[PDB]
Design an enzyme around this catalytic site. Structure first.
Site, PDB file in Angstrom:
ATOM      1  N   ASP A 197     -63.669  -0.222 -42.811  1.00 10.85           N
ATOM      2  CA  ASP A 197     -63.159  -0.237 -41.443  1.00 10.85           C
ATOM      3  C   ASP A 197     -62.730   1.148 -40.963  1.00 10.85           C
ATOM      4  OD1 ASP A 197     -61.339  -2.917 -39.797  1.00 10.85           O
ATOM      5  OD2 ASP A 197     -62.165  -1.062 -38.974  1.00 10.85           O
ATOM      6  N   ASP A 221     -55.140   1.835 -44.683  1.00  5.66           N
ATOM      7  CA  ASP A 221     -55.700   0.528 -44.336  1.00  5.66           C
ATOM      8  C   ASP A 221     -56.979   0.235 -45.122  1.00  5.66           C
ATOM      9  OD1 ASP A 221     -55.430  -1.889 -42.841  1.00  5.66           O
ATOM     10  OD2 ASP A 221     -54.765  -0.726 -41.106  1.00  5.66           O
ATOM     11  N   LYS A 272     -61.981   4.307 -39.044  1.00  5.01           N
ATOM     12  CA  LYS A 272     -61.968   4.733 -37.643  1.00  5.01           C
ATOM     13  C   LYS A 272     -60.744   5.609 -37.432  1.00  5.01           C
ATOM     14  CE  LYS A 272     -60.993  -0.105 -36.528  1.00  5.01           C
ATOM     15  NZ  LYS A 272     -60.555  -1.058 -35.468  1.00  5.01           N
ATOM     16  N   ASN A 321     -57.273   4.270 -38.137  1.00  2.00           N
ATOM     17  CA  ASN A 321     -56.897   4.146 -39.538  1.00  2.00           C
ATOM     18  C   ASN A 321     -56.777   5.497 -40.238  1.00  2.00           C
ATOM     19  OD1 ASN A 321     -56.768   1.326 -39.489  1.00  2.00           O
ATOM     20  ND2 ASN A 321     -58.945   1.112 -39.989  1.00  2.00           N
ATOM     21  N   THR A 359     -63.323  -1.893 -32.747  1.00  2.00           N
ATOM     22  CA  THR A 359     -64.062  -1.693 -33.989  1.00  2.00           C
ATOM     23  C   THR A 359     -65.551  -1.494 -33.739  1.00  2.00           C
ATOM     24  OG1 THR A 359     -62.445  -3.020 -35.216  1.00  2.00           O
ATOM     25  CG2 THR A 359     -64.615  -2.701 -36.226  1.00  2.00           C
TER      26      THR A 359
END
Ligand SMILES: CCOc1ccc2cc(-c3nn(C4CCOCC4)c(N)c3C(N)=O)cnc2c1
Ligand SMILES: [Ca+2]
Ligand SMILES: [Ca+2]
Length: 421
Positions: free
Chosen positions: A132, A153, A134, A137, A164
């Site tokens: 995930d 995260d 990005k 995070n 997302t």
């Protein structure tokens, strides 16, 4: 009997926000007055596996020592929750830095992205896939200018239960989470740093562009940008993962090496001689003395203390992987001498020194081991620091730690203080 694991060492100051897996709060060590970030995870609501499986995974996360990866110190628990205590970072999300600057030069985006490449490369070598990645995070450690970034995260997807669209790889749309998906998300980030736009711009439409995998450097701002940058981005946004390049390849790309050349200067000599003196004393002291010092440098120190040694660590890291290896120490020692003006064996000293600092046998000196050997022992010997260290070992809480109760590798606290010194 009337003492709790977490509530006995820590005091809750405020709430920092809601992590997806649980609440995140700021807490203070009751002795050392050192502040920390703790995630509180509800066991009953959030658990999918046995508590044993969870603690095994959290132990693996706790030994991830990389400057660009979130640091975790310990895992406690009570009848209702797990308490995971970690390093506190106050600069906020990288997403907000993008709103302010709205795009970055090739010099600025390279310093940022080099750190993401370093952390992802480290994560993959320890068989962790973010899944995930990005800007939301990625946190900044502080509000200073060139402070390091920190990836968060990641890790609990298997154990607990919980914008997302821009950053996901096509294969994630088809139920595949392999190491390559991260390299894709990193490419999208680098695309947004240089241009300020997502390469793939309703959510059905954004995902539609992702599925075809079609992006373009058509926006007017790409004409000024270099061809090497576009070469890197192309290799990262490759539709087929089998042809997409690796995190290591991203870090070694020539574009990165062009803007990644932090190298020692005469201004840093004061902090290099100091680091050298403490390293020699470290190698002289017996193994028992050394391990006690690592234990306290790695568990009981904060960024502000190691702030000066962070820049030295970052300049000695030529390849930017986040670790100092045998050759990097030889070259840093030869260049340290050259800045002074002294002619330079160095190689023999370091080879004798490598086993003594690489206490984990990892093949290179990680940051925590560098601090333990390069910091003034006087800072680690503060009374509150030794109070906390002693209390950790006394599981019984009698007031005297048994000989086997010492896992630093009957004694009163005052006998314990003399032993460290
Ligand atoms: C195995 C899992 O363990 C951990 C351990 C430590 C963690 C710390 C944070 C954290 N989140 N935030 C805010 C919260 C509100 O949103 C913006 C960012 C900080 N300022 C944090 C920090 N460490 O300073 C988040 N997740 C963590 C997970
Ligand atoms: Ca290195
Ligand atoms: Ca090591």
């Amino acid at each position: 009997g009337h003492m709790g694991t977490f509530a006995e060492r820590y005091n809750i100051v405020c709430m920092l926000g809601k992590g997806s897996f649980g609440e995140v709060l700021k807490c203070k060590d009751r002795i050392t007055q050192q502040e920390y970030a703790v995630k509180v995870i509800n066991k009953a609501s959030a658990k999918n596996k046995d508590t044993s499986t969870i603690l095994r995974e959290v132990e693996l996360l706790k030994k991830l020592d990389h400057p660009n990866i979130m640091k975790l110190f310990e895992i406690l628990e009570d009848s209702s929750s797990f308490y995971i205590v970690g390093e506190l970072y106050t600069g906020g999300e990288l997403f907000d830095e993008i709103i302010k600057r709205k795009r970055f030069s090739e010099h600025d985006a390279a310093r940022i992205i080099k750190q993401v490449f370093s952390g992802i490369t480290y994560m993959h070598k320890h068989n962790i896939v973010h899944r995930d990645l990005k800007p939301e995070n990625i946190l900044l450690e502080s509000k200073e200018k060139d402070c390091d970034i920190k990836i968060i995260d990641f890790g609990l997807s298997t154990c607990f239960q919980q914008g997302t669209a821009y950053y996901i790889a096509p294969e994630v749309l088809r139920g595949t989470y392999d190491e390559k998906c991260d390299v894709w998300s990193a490419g999208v980030i680098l695309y947004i740093l240089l241009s300020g736009t997502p390469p793939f711009y309703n959510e059905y439409d954004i995902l539609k562009r992702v599925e075809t995998g079609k992006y373009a450097f058509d926006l007017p701002q790409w004409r000024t940008i270099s061809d090497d940058a576009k070469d890197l981005i192309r290799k990262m946004l490759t539709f087929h993962p089998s042809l997409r390049i690796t995190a290591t390849q991203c870090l070694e790309h020539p574009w990165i090496q062009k803007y990644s050349s932090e190298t020692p200067t005469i201004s840093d000599l004061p902090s290099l001689e100091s680091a050298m003196t403490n390293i020699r004393q470290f190698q002289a002291e017996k193994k028992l003395a050394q391990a006690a010092l690592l234990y306290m440098a790695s568990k009981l120190t904060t960024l502000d203390e190691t702030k000066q040694l962070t820049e030295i660590f970052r300049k000695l890291d030529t390849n930017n992987d986040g670790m100092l290896d045998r050759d990097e120490l030889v070259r840093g020692y030869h260049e340290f001498m050259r800045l002074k003006g002294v002619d330079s064996t160095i190689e023999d000293q370091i080879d004798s020194l490598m086993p003594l600092l690489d206490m984990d046998g990892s093949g290179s000196i990680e940051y925590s081991e560098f601090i333990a050997s390069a910091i003034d022992r006087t800072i680690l010997l503060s009374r509150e620091r030794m109070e906390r260290a002693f209390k950790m070992f006394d599981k019984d809480g009698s007031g005297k730690i048994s000989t086997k109760e010492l896992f630093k590798l009957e004694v009163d606290f005052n006998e314990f203080v003399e032993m460290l010194q």
